[PDB]
């Protein structure tokens, strides 16, 4: 579900969020913390009504600037959050 994918001088994490829609996801960054929230209201699926929420927090290494944190969603529902090093 989660993958640590740091590169030489670039912080990088991956996360399986296939159950959520792009607008159901929130990526928030503050003081050495990246924060991912996935959330949708009760809605029908095949088996009935499901509502989901999750909050995922990653610690950001020192020196890393939260201005530089970015994200992207793969078609197959994998969210990536990266940041370069100083």
């Amino acid at each position: 579900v989660s993958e640590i994918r740091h590169t030489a001088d670039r912080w990088r994490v991956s996360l399986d969020v296939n159950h959520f829609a792009p607008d159901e996801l929130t990526v928030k960054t503050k003081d050495g913390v990246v924060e991912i929230t996935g959330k949708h209201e009760e809605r029908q699926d095949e088996h009935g009504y499901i509502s989901r929420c999750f909050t995922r927090k990653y610690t950001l290494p020192p020196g890393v600037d939260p201005t530089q944190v970015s994200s992207s969603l793969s078609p197959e529902g994998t969210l990536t959050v990266e940041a370069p090093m100083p």
Partner: peptide
């Protein structure tokens, strides 16, 4: 999809 980040 190029999701934005809130600071």
């Amino acid at each position: 999809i190029t999701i934005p980040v809130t600071f």
